[PDB]
Design a protein around this ligand. Structure first.
Ligand code: 0HK
Length: 436
């Protein structure tokens, strides 16, 4: 009978169609919307590119492989198929690594990486990923039968020769899947917790500013980098003494772009830990929303834990949601008189709720990473765990389970473009305007 084989093959063909029309919709949408011409979208573009080539070639040739239960198109066809397949998938997981380190460096490195990232740099990183994936797999497959001497793969099958042993296969699974997964997992949980601090920075870049030399605040106080007050005394000799105390060497005045970035984070974390430690700042910080929190930090980042602890009547109104009543309550202080230009933008935040005074695009959690990673894990885990199982025995895993797990790794490339439309609304309207 085996008509179910033809039926299932048609389903996989349908699945392959959904994959290729889903990925080409992403490619087209990116090149016609103009509003999606950002860096992170270009990473999703290449991810869609890798899913496209693996959804138009790999899924089709594997369908015929399980259909006729053999490989009857020579050895070169099998070698080139597995090469392109593995490279594309390895470029896919490296791309996921790129995205993971992308918006993580956008957090930890506001100046080194975040303030220096173009579409050209993205193409280099992606291009580098494909080159690495190429060198790792393509010569390893092709030039292996020309290395040992004779081909192990018999006419009628199609697999990898240097993955004969289950030990070397499991080792590759660790270094190419388990290791990237744990990293992306660690990074993601260090993004979801540290996404609120990204916008905390842009406020301090407007108020305090950025400079490598040593200047003076809106009152004549020595400060280097991003709002880091070295000292309060009008003496330059002792000002640099505190500067070199934070760096580690004789800067003789000026610093670099990475040093200023480092000294910035040392004062922000000290402020936040200065809020939680303080008995009059901790309940206030926990009574405000995540958006109103950076505004409070801006006060602590400047005045200090003590300076903000001197506003008793003010902190009481913040907890009691007396925003407009606290807006005028903060307009009667030395801070509002000495450096008033920035105070107008801080107080406005406490009475409205949004940062329309500072403008700045809002950034909340990782809306894209959660979908694509969970999809990537759930789909590929039944295969890699099966490799772990296959390692400690032989006939413990049937060929059917290998084919299914191989297909589960294929639907990963199918769900990935669907994850794009199941998140951002800009991708939604662009997938809707198309096709008409
Ligand atoms: C979807 N794939 C195309 C197929 C199944 C998956 O296989 C895996 O997840 C593996 O750990 C292994 C494949 C083979 C031995 S260990 C990876 C390989 C490369 C990057 S991760 C991922 C890729 C890989 O080509 C196979």
């Amino acid at each position: 009978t085996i008509w179910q084989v033809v039926f299932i093959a048609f389903l996989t063909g349908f699945l392959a169609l959904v994959t290729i029309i889903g990925n080409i919709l992403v490619i087209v949408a990116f090149k016609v919307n103009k509003q999606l011409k950002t860096v992170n979208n270009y990473f999703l573009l290449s991810l869609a590119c890798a899913d496209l080539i693996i959804g138009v070639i790999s899924m089709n040739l594997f369908t015929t492989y399980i259909i006729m239960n053999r490989w009857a198109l020579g050895n070169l066809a099998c070698d080139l198929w597995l090469s392109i397949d593995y490279v594309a998938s390895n470029a896919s997981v490296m791309n996921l690594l790129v995205i993971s380190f992308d918006r993580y460096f956008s957090i930890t490195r506001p100046l080194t990486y975040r303030a220096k990232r173009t579409t050209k740099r993205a193409g280099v990183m992606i291009g580098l990923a494909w080159v690495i994936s190429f060198v790792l797999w393509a010569p390893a497959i092709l030039f292996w039968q020309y290395f040992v001497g004779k081909r192990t793969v018999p006419p009628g099958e199609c697999f990898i020769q240097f993955l004969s042993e289950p030990t070397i296969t499991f080792g590759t699974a660790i270094a190419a899947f388990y290791m990237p997964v744990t990293i992306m997992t660690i990074l993601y949980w260090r993004i979801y917790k540290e996404t609120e601090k990204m916008n905390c920075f842009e406020m301090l870049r407007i108020d305090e500013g950025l400079r490598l030399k040593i200047y003076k605040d809106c009152e004549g106080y020595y400060t280097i980098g991003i709002g880091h007050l070295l000292t309060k005394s009008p003496s330059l000799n002792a000002a640099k003494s505190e500067l070199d105390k934070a760096i580690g060497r004789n800067t003789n005045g000026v610093i670099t772009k990475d040093e200023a970035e480092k000294l910035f984070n040392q004062d922000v974390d000290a402020a936040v830990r200065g809020i939680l430690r303080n008995a009059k700042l901790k309940p206030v910080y926990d009574s405000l929303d995540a958006v109103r929190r950076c505004a409070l930090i801006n006060m602590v980042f400047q005045m200090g834990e003590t300076g903000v602890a001197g506003f008793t009547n003010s902190l009481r109104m913040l907890q009691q949601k007396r925003w407009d009543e606290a807006a005028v309550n903060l307009a009667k202080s030395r801070w509002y008189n000495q450096c008033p230009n920035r105070a107008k933008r801080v107080i406005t935040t406490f009475r409205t709720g949004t940062w329309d005074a500072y403008l700045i695009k809002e950034k909340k959690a990782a809306q894209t990473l959660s979908a694509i990673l969970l999809a990537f894990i759930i789909t590929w885990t039944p295969y890699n765990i099966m490799v772990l199982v296959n390692t400690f025995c032989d006939s413990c895993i049937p060929k059917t389970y290998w084919n299914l797990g191989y297909w589960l790794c294929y639907i990963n490339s199918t769900v990935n473009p669907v994850c794009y439309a199941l998140c951002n609304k800009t991708f939604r309207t662009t997938f809707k305007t198309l096709l008409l």
